[PDB]
């Protein structure tokens, strides 16, 4: 189906403790493959997936040279912004960036994006056409003005619509066995008593991929959206995800409820009852 490649960078300052901590990691959809940690004893861009263990020292030297570069830029931004918002020398701060491209259905390029954040909040984002920017706040406008003049919006559209997608499609093949394959969800129900009069019905969905999923509780058909507990979709840690939905029901009325499970790796939507 449709695919994405995505890079996530986070840099954080440590006052008195010298050099700031830096981390970075890349994804091809919901699977991590590369990882750098400035604290990491390796001082190199380590591999994370099996299908990347496949690249000669030519790669492990570029992607490692390149991340130390990024790390060095962020090393400066951390100080600029400390001034742009006139903060004390003390105190920790964070800048984060994320970029990638969305290869559309037909495996050609559909969307690009590059977003910047200071201290958790939006700072600057490359808008749609990859030739203009959007500033979240007044301070950010200086960075824009700097950037449209030093030609970042234009030199970025070349990495995105060009070599980014290209290498993505390249990663797809080298790892089709996974990134192109699927795992539909293994679904089940559990009963848990709250009192002699009430129980919780928990609807489970496990070991699946991609993360996108929907769990719905009905009562004779009428959606129980409102009195439903949902947990954040979590990682199993083998490249699969779990999730559950839960309703408190009157004891005896269990047969009245059904849990619906919409997912991509499911030809038909599902429906589960506690007692069929």
């Amino acid at each position: 189906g449709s695919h994405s490649m995505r890079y996530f960078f986070t840099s954080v300052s440590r006052p008195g403790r010298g050099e700031p901590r830096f981390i970075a990691v890349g994804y091809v959809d919901d699977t991590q493959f590369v990882r750098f940690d400035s604290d990491a004893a390796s001082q190199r861009m380590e591999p994370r997936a099996p299908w990347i263990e496949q690249e000669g020292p030519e790669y492990w030297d570029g992607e490692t040279r390149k991340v130390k570069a990024h790390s060095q830029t962020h090393r400066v931004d951390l100080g600029t912004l400390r001034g742009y918002y006139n903060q004390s020398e003390a105190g920790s701060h964070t800048v984060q960036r994320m970029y990638g491209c969305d290869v559309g259905s037909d495996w050609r390029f559909l969307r690009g994006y590059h977003q910047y954040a200071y201290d958790g909040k939006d700072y600057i984002a490359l808008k749609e056409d990859l030739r203009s920017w959007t500033a979240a706040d007044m301070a950010a406008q200086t960075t824009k003005h700097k950037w449209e003049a030093a030609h970042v919006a234009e030199q970025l559209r070349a990495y995105l619509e060009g070599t980014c997608v290209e290498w993505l499609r390249r990663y797809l093949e080298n790892g089709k066995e996974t990134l192109q394959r699927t795992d539909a969800p293994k679904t089940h129900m559990t009963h848990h008593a709250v009192s002699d009069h009430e129980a919780t019905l928990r609807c489970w969905a496990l070991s699946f991929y991609p993360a996108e999923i929907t769990l719905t509780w009905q009562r004779d058909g009428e959606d129980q959206t409102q009195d439903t507990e949902l947990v954040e979709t979590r990682p199993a840690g083998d490249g699969t995800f779990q999730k559950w939905a839960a309703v408190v029901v009157p004891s005896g009325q269990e047969q009245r409820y059904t849990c619906h499970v919409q997912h991509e790796g499911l030809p038909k939507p599902l429906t589960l009852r506690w007692e069929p």
């Binding site: 960078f9 390149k66 990024h70 060095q72 830029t73 400066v76 912004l81 960036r97 970029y99 700097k146």
Partner: peptide, 12 residues
């Protein structure tokens, strides 16, 4: 593979 982000033009 990664990208630009090398400096000094990439500075904020």
């Amino acid at each position: 593979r990664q990208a630009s982000i090398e400096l000094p033009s990439m500075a904020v």
